A paper describes a structure:
The l,d-transpeptidase LdtMt2, which is responsible for the formation of 3 → 3 cross-links in the cell wall peptidoglycan, has been identified as essential for M. tuberculosis virulence. The extramembrane section of LdtMt2 consists of three domains, two of which have an immunoglobulin-related fold, and the catalytic domain which has an ErfK/YbiS/YhnG fold. The LdtMt2 active site within the catalytic domain is bordered by a flexible loop (residues 300–323), sometimes referred to as the active site “lid”, which creates two entrances to the active site: the inner and outer cavities. The Ldt mechanism is proposed to be analogous to that proposed for the PBPs, although employing a catalytic triad analogous to that observed in some cysteine-proteases, involving Cys354, His336 and Ser337, for the formation of the cross-link between the donor and acceptor stem substrates.
Residue numbers in the entry: 59 to 407
Amino acid sequence: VPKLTASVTDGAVGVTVDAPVSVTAADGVLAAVTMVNDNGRPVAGRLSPDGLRWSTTEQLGYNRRYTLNATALGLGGAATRQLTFQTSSPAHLTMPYVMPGDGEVVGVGEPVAIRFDENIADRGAAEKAIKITTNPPVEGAFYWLNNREVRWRPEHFWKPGTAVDVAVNTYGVDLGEGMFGEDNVQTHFTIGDEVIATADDNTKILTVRVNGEVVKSMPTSMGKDSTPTANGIYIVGSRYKHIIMDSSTYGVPVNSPNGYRTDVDWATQISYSGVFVHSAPWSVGAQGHTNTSHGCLNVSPSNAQWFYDHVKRGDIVEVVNTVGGTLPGIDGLGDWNIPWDQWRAGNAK
Ligand code: NA
């Protein structure tokens, strides 16, 4: 007599939709399989050529009730089952967003970033749902900067030519306190040339190195003693032909002593706290000699444009020997300032 198996049991509740629903016939073949929702709408599925396995072919829905009818035939006899089950009903939904973009070529400092639009009560579940693939394979780990964003990077800077695949399979996954993922995301990026630029407060020079060779030496003016540029490793972020810098976006009023509202050209972002490489005609004389800025690396127009043209997202800017501290690891572009052993251990709780 044919036997029927299913990936769900009749009367089940909280069936997660991260996996498809299957039905298997033993000692026989599947003659008919149908699955409809509470409204009577049929679900897409495909039967295997051998007739032994049937699986849904489209993702299932939240807060739904599904009814499954299966018939199995064989030389001996026939068997029919009806199964109804309710999927999980999330309390809230959160959509993930992944950087860098699909197909992008990025520098050796670009981490993998998964940002959610809600606080994540169960970080371990989120890390479990994210699969990272590297070629050549290299060790990495997760670390959380705030409650909504997590990062993945190796111990050392990426090796150029490394392929990276990010599968955020959070759909159907309970991320804590009834917070389920809105969808799945799949992005892929590649590591380009090694580009490391160093800013030494002693020489007041920003040197750009491509694959270990000096290609540009830029005299610069960094943060003055009152508002210094922090030392450490910076990841290059967004680039702007021109951008109005407003201190108020960082909580500093414009009318305050340290506030400002200045329009600059050829601005490359290297920290979330507002540190940029940008064109500063007004300080070309100070550049290479004294620090006079709020934190940004002031350089000449031609050098700023050159930086814009030859530096890509993920490249590195390291600052040393300034009177400031060290760029916070939680900044958003300061991932590499966290010691490896701390990063490796993670903060999943
Ligand atoms: Na329902």
